Structures are given as C-alpha cells and as structure tokens.
Design a protein around this ligand. Structure first.
Ligand code: UPZ
Length: 164
C-alpha cells in the first residue's frame, strides 16, 4: 500500500508531537519515493534535523531544505532536481502535502503542508500526499509563522521515518 511516514517536530527545543503523512505512491510514485527515502534517511541524507524555515499563517508550512536550512537548498534522492511527475492531485484544503519548487521541473526535497485550500498552486506544484494524523501539530507550526514566512520559534524535525 501507500507509504505512511512521520515527522516528529520540536519548537524551540520542546516537542510538539508527530505529523503522519500518507504518500500517494499510487498517483505519484517517483515523488512519493523521494519523500519516503528522505524520511528514513536510507540514502545517507534526509530530513532528520532540518527545519520548517518558511511558515505563513493561513497558507502553508514549508520545510525540507536540509542542506542550507533557508530555502535555497535541498536535493532529491535522484539528483539535485527531478521533473514534475503530474499535477493530478489538487490542493484541496488543509493537510495537503505538496512539493515546493522554483519553477517547472525543479523538485528537490523542499515540501509544504497546506493549512488552507490553495487552488492557485494546482498545475504548478506536485501534490503527493496528505496529513493522516497531527493536524494539531501543523496548526502549532503555522502559529509560529508570519506574513513574511520568517518563523518566530525554531521549528525542527527532530526525527522522521517510515511507519509502513
Ligand atoms: C524549493 C523552492 O523554494 C522556494 O522557492 C522558496 C524557499 N524558501 C523560501 C522562503 C521564502 O520566503 N521564499 N521561499 C521560496 C520562494
């Protein structure tokens, strides 16, 4: 079946809890596999210890830059970037998991979790899963963002991996 993965998240060094994500490998296998392996760290790099560096209330929480920790970096398990697999899944509401990018076919490791429907990203960002459990953690993260995206607490993925 589709992978279930987890992110355990701290804010200012204290645990907020766990976000569980379903990865829609049935729709976007290459994109799901990238995220799954970055969660386990099995290629020798991944999300463990990295941050939510850009968080905008009433929009989304972005993370996954495990190389530069600021939005300029990250890399996929395939190489630095990989193509947009498809745009079939849509940004339908809070809890959608989608790939950040800097234009067509620039997926790396950065991702975002929506806290609202973000329909204008349909056809531009590859949606590849959604929150199964832990929206409360997502709302805490969101509450530490700002209009500019700068966070007001240090939000760290302390642990991550695959549940199934
Ligand atoms: C994977 C591509 O990531 C981005 O394009 C990106 C990453 N981080 C930030 C912080 C910010 O304020 N803007 N920002 C952007 C546009």
């Amino acid at each position: 079946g589709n992978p279930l993965v987890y992110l355990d998240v701290d804010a200012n060094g204290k645990p907020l809890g766990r976000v569980v994500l379903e990865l829609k490998a049935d729709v976007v296998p290459k994109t799901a596999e990238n995220f799954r392996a970055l969660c386990t760290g099995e290629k020798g790099f991944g999300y463990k210890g990295s941050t939510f560096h850009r968080v905008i209330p009433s929009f989304m929480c972005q993370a996954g830059d495990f190389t530069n920790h600021n939005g300029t970096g990250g890399k996929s398990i395939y190489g630095s970037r990989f193509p947009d697999e498809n745009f079939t899944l849509k940004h339908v509401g809070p809890g959608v998991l989608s790939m950040a990018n800097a234009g067509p076919n620039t997926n790396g490791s950065q991702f975002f979790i929506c806290t609202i429907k973000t329909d204008w990203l349909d056809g531009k960002h590859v949606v590849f899963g959604h929150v199964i459990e832990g929206m409360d953690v997502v709302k805490k993260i969101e509450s530490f963002g700002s209009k500019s995206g700068r966070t007001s607490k240090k939000i760290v993925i302390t642990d991550c991996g695959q549940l199934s």
